[PDB]
Every structure is written in structure tokens, then in C-alpha cells.
């Protein structure tokens, strides 16, 4: 089937992202590799690379067509959820929040975790853009998605996102502790190439 190779592609991308191995993700685009991606996956790969290197933006036509195709589908499955969650930083926020709100109104074990990640990404993006009425809703939905589920990775990144939201809105000394506890959880479990991504963010937040 088709949705069996897309999962392997996403897992390969996320494993090369953890090792910080650029130039191996930037080799699926070139016309010599195993994975040949349809123009909706090339856009997702370019959007993922854009987070590691700010000069690999997708074109405006690609994003226009991706948003047009997203606003048309009605059965949101394993494909559209990933395409949207991995392009939160390029698609305009106004159209990201609408789709994330519609996804949380369509209420499996592998799909709850794939919706939790999209919700957390939308929450981080909404904290960046300073939309605070759109953040309480996301926090209230996410803390109900993570209810009695043993997803410690999503729970850790959501702890960090909650600390971020609390430091942004009120500038209080109680979001700092949540961010530092998330960093502690990353440091105890031995995630060395993942603790750095959050330590750099914390350092550029607190120091200005």
C-alpha cells in the first residue's frame, strides 16, 4: 500500500533529524534517491529543512496549493494530519489554527498520539504568535488528550510548552520551573542531541 512507505519516510526523516544529519535529509529532494516524493511531500521536506536552515523555504505556489488541498478534504486521516503538523511553520497561522480546531472536533491508539503532536505544535506556534485566547483552548484539549496515556515524550514537550506559555503571558517565575523540569527530564533519560534544542531556546528566551 501507499501509506506503508510514507510512515517509513517520516521515520527516516525524524531519525536523521535527531542525529542532526543535514545533507542526508537534503538528498530526498534531488533526483537520485530511493524515496520519490509527490509534490506534497517535497513541500513537507522543505518545510522541515526550513527549521534547520532558514534559506530552504518552499515557494508560494507550493504552499498555496497545499493549503487549497487541505481546506478541501473531509476525511482527515494519517496523511493530512502529518502533512499539516509538519508544515505549521510555513503555512500562515490563521489557517493553521482553523484546521487544528476542526481536527479536534472529529474526536485508535496510533491516531490519538498523532493528533496530540499536531495539537502541541499548534500550541507552540500560538505561543510564538501571541494569541492567548487560542492557547487556553489548546491547553485544555491537550491535557485531556494525554489523560491516562503513557506518552512521556508528548507529555515532556507539553510540559515545556506550558512553561513557555506561562512565561510569555504573565512573565512569572512558575513557567521557568516547568521549562527547567522538562530539561531535567531530557537530561536524566540521556537525550543529548535533544536536550540541546530546548536549552538553546531557553537560553535565548531568558536572556532577553
Amino acid at each position: 500500500t501507499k501509506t506503508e512507505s510514507f510512515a517509513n519516510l517520516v521515520q527516516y526523516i525524524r531519525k536523521q533529524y535527531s542525529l542532526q544529519n543535514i545533507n542526508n535529509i537534503q538528498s530526498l529532494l534531488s533526483d537520485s534517491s530511493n524515496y520519490t516524493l509527490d509534490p506534497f511531500e517535497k513541500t513537507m521536506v522543505k518545510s522541515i529543512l526550513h527549521t534547520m536552515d532558514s534559506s530552504i523555504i518552499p515557494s508560494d505556489d507550493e504552499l498555496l496549493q497545499l493549503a487549497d488541498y487541505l481546506f478541501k478534504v473531509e476525511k482527515w486521516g494519517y496523511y493530512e494530519i502529518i502533512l499539516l503538523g509538519n508544515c505549521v511553520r510555513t503555512i500562515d497561522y490563521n489557517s493553521v489554527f482553523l484546521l487544528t480546531k476542526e481536527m479536534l472536533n472529529n474526536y485508535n491508539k496510533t491516531n490519538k498520539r498523532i493528533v496530540t503532536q499536531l495539537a502541541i505544535n499548534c500550541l507552540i506556534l500560538s505561543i510564538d504568535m501571541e494569541e492567548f485566547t487560542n492557547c487556553f483552548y489548546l491547553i485544555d484539549e491537550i491535557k485531556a488528550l494525554l489523560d491516562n496515556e503513557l506518552n512521556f515524550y508528548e507529555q515532556t514537550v507539553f510540559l515545556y510548552a506550558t512553561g513557555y506559555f506561562e512565561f510569555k503571558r504573565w512573565q512569572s517565575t512558575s513557567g521557568i520551573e516547568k521549562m527547567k523540569q522538562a530539561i531535567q527530564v531530557l537530561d536524566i533519560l540521556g537525550e543529548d542531541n535533544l536536550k540541546l534544542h530546548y536549552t538553546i531556546h531557553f537560553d535565548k528566551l531568558i536572556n532577553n
Binding site: 521515520q11 527549521t51 534547520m52 499536531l118 507552540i124
Partner: peptide, 8 residues
């Protein structure tokens, strides 16, 4: 960045 790669 601090966003998680959805799907992996």
C-alpha cells in the same frame, strides 16, 4: 527548534 516531527 522545539517542534516535534509529527509521525515519528
Amino acid at each position: 527548534d522545539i517542534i516535534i516531527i509529527v509521525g515519528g
